[PDB]
Design a protein around this ligand. Structure first.
Ligand code: LMT
Ligand code: LMT
Ligand SMILES: OC[C@H]1O[C@H](O[C@H]2[C@H](O)[C@@H](O)[C@@H](O)O[C@@H]2CO)[C@H](O)[C@@H](O)[C@@H]1O
Lengths: 230, 121, 221, 222
């Protein structure tokens, strides 16, 4: 049922923090889709169906965050001020990046649409694709991703700080320690793009290519950390 | 004395509790024995000596006992016959004669520890 | 999490008719972690703090194993310093207890001495082979150590087969945490004279006879 | 209380996946209605009252999905990665067909309104009803319905794959197997309309007319 067979799930009962959180995750994925205009004609209907690829990418991304949230609150059943604070920071970041994700997802769907040869529609709608704007694109979304994983690391550290109060066993202590490392390692990749973009070594699009290409190198580093624990 | 031979991995204590209710309603003793290698000790002892009255084993060993003449033909009335599944009666039939009473179908399964292995092979 | 924040906590608790920390001050094994937290300059620092606790009326002068244990189990003190063996008596009482890392002193951790409970055969015994049988085939077995452990906990058993059961216990985790922050005692013949020197030194400074500087002088000799 | 008396309901306690899901179903049916503009004049009010027939159709359709969701999570109490994944795909599909259904329900509510003789308003409001558009319509809502029943089949198959872990008895195994068949049979009707509209045998409205008729005979064709 769960991630670890040695973990004793303290948060099987639903709480207010989790109920509130569920609404906000639902509210996020739901308003991402339902923020669109209602089709009034066949032309609008076909236009609206072009949005499903961008939405699928966004939704997939948000549930992945929801899953990590579900697992944390399941593991520790925490409900204190500091957990509430860190939880709010998380939902706050999520919320401010919902509509920007809708944007990024639509933009990248057009770029990848052009490449594969499915469509040939204009990108002038997005408003001047300049070096400064494409750099700010990385820095923005990179700063968002870094923060989410940074907060997950802080949340696990708060549970680690309360290990004795939570009666955590050697397996659970190890999991908690590994979960901190995992989230800091996850955060490192957007932190590395963001830094590369902010320095801008090449002074041109090359910077943005490299910054974007680091997301493709998540998979190998994740495998190293997974292999080390096994 | 009513003597029954059944394997030691089965529920002989429970079979004895049935035998204890039988003695209350009749007066006959019902001892339940579980000797080692009873599947190959029965056809040697039951042929020559007395052995058991009733022998319990999987249906596969019973055809050999039937050919050798070590088992009485079973004659159960329709009403008793109807209480058991007709496919079960087929397993206890050798050359158009019922050679035993069917009790239960047995098959091996994979028994696993859910704590040590939640999603087994 | 720190030794230096106990006086504040004690002021808070004494108002409500409760002590903060009560532990065995007579036996030096219990006071050594605080003394050895920094280290000499480290022993002088650690002991002066311990002396200041008794001087500020936070701890009693003749606090022993029994009155400390009883006070914690009764629900009079919020904290105590003890080993695995002490847990069973707490379980007997109706006290929701926790076992955790020892407090830090001067930022650095309090280094508790690590003991390995060990069974030795007396050289002047005729039953040497009978004792070897008992120790190997009956005591140092899963079943054997279980019996001892359900009476009064042994701590982190030396048996390889007991790793899973040890690891499932939160108190063992806290014990291993402190054991890593501490160090194993050398077995050397001078340990006896050492322990006696520390036992007197701590009692003299606790009661109010010898100074902290004069305690380490007589103890190093 | 439940569907089967022989089924032992593992999901009587509410979970996060079910709480999140409930918000999303509510968020869907609620934003379908409340996505409309607030009437500022009687003219705007009487217009939003025409919209209730399509809303009733839509709401009825969404709760039917919510019911199937409620029964699945009640039966197995599942909460694993794969169940989360399949559950997300479902809510994703739902969410994409909320505003499209608001449109189809309005589109049919106008056509069927004209037939019965309740109203006589235009269908040019819907912007060219060409063969390709009415074909794409049946390919769209047919692809949506197929993919919702397809997901329900996958979810029941995931429970069937974990039958031993869930300690499912012979009655429960049978129910699970029957629920897979039911959902694949439900998915087959939209899969047929969709294939008919795509192949386009007649090359004219005869195709689209049939594609809509296969849903009206849901029970008999099953
Ligand atoms: C890979 C293949 C898929 C490529 C998909 C690219 C989608 O690109 C995106 O399309 C939708 C079409 O509705 C446009 O969206 C437009 O229509 C929607 C229709 O409801 C309105 O809600 C919105 O006001 C308007 O911006 C986006 O402005 C465009 O960026
Ligand atoms: C059967 C008889 C009933 C037929 C009902 C058909 C409903 O017809 C539908 O009317 C509503 C009027 O509110 C129109 O809808 C319009 O009004 C609402 C007013 O709040 C706006 O929010 C909506 O965005 C706009 O499109 C639809 O474009 C039309 O298709
Ligand atoms: O107090 C000094 C004393 O400490 C240690 O003894 C411990 C013993 O190891 C524990 O098992 C526990 O029972 O308490 C004893 C102290 O009260 C040293 O092992 C010993 O040499 C030394 O005298």
């Amino acid at each position: 049922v769960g991630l670890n067979p040695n973990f004793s799930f303290r948060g099987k009962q639903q709480t207010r923090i989790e109920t509130f959180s569920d609404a906000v995750f639902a509210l996020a994925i739901a308003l991402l889709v339902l923020s669109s205009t209602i089709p009034e004609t066949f032309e609008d209907l076909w236009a609206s169906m072009r949005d499903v690829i961008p939405f699928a990418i966004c939704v997939a991304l948000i549930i992945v965050i929801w899953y990590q949230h579900y697992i944390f609150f399941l593991k520790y059943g925490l409900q204190d001020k500091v957990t509430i604070l860190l939880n709010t920071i998380l939902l706050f970041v999520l919320l401010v990046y919902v509509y920007p994700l809708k944007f990024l997802a639509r933009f990248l769907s057009e770029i990848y649409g052009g490449i594969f040869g499915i469509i040939e529609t204009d990108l002038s709608r997005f408003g001047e694709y300049s070096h400064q704007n494409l750099k700010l694109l990385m820095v923005n979304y990179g700063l968002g991703a870094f923060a989410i994983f940074l907060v997950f690391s802080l949340m696990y550290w708060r549970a680690y700080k309360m290990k004795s109060l939570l009666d955590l066993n050697s397996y659970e202590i190890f999991d908690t320690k590994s979960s901190i490392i995992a989230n800091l390692l996850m955060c490192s990749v957007p932190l590395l793009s963001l830094i590369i973009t902010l320095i801008d070594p090449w002074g041109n699009f090359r910077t943005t290519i490299l910054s974007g290409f680091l997301y493709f190198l998540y998979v190998p580093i994740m495998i190293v950390f997974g292999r080390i624990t096994s | 004395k009513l003597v029954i031979w059944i394997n030691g991995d089965k529920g002989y204590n429970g079979l004895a509790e049935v035998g204890k209710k039988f003695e209350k309603d009749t007066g006959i003793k019902v001892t339940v024995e579980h000797p080692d290698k009873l599947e190959e000790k029965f056809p040697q002892v039951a042929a020559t000596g007395d052995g058991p009255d009733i022998i319990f084993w999987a249906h596969d060993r019973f055809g050999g006992y039937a050919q050798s003449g070590l088992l009485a033909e079973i004659t159960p009335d329709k009403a008793f016959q109807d209480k058991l599944y007709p496919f079960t009666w087929d397993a206890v039939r050798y050359n158009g004669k019922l050679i035993a009473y069917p009790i239960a179908v047995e098959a091996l399964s994979l028994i696993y520890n859910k704590d040590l292995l939640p999603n087994p092979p | 999490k720190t030794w230096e924040e106990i006086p504040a906590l004690d002021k808070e608790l004494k108002a409500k008719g409760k002590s903060a920390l009560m532990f065995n001050l007579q036996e030096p094994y219990f006071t050594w972690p605080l003394i050895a937290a920094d280290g000499n300059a480290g022993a002088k620092a650690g002991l002066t703090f311990l002396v200041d606790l008794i001087k500020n009326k936070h701890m009693n002068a003749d606090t022993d194993y029994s009155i400390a244990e009883a006070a914690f189990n009764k629900g009079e003190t919020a904290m105590t310093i003890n080993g695995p063996w002490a847990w069973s008596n707490i379980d007997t009482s109706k006290v929701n207890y926790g076992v955790t890392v020892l407090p830090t002193f001067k930022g650095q951790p309090s280094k508790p001495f690590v003991g390995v409970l060990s069974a030795g055969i007396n050289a002047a015994s005729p039953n040497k082979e009978l004792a070897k049988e008992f120790l190997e085939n009956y005591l140092l077995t899963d079943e054997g150590l279980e019996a001892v452990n359900k009476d009064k906990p042994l701590g982190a058993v030396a048996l390889k087969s007991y790793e899973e059961e040890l690891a499932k216990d939160p108190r063992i985790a806290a014990t291993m945490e402190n054991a890593q922050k501490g160090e194993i005692m050398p077995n050397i013949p001078q340990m006896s004279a050492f322990w006696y020197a520390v036992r007197t030194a701590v009692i003299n400074a606790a009661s109010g006879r010898q100074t902290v500087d004069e305690a380490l002088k007589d103890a190093q000799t």
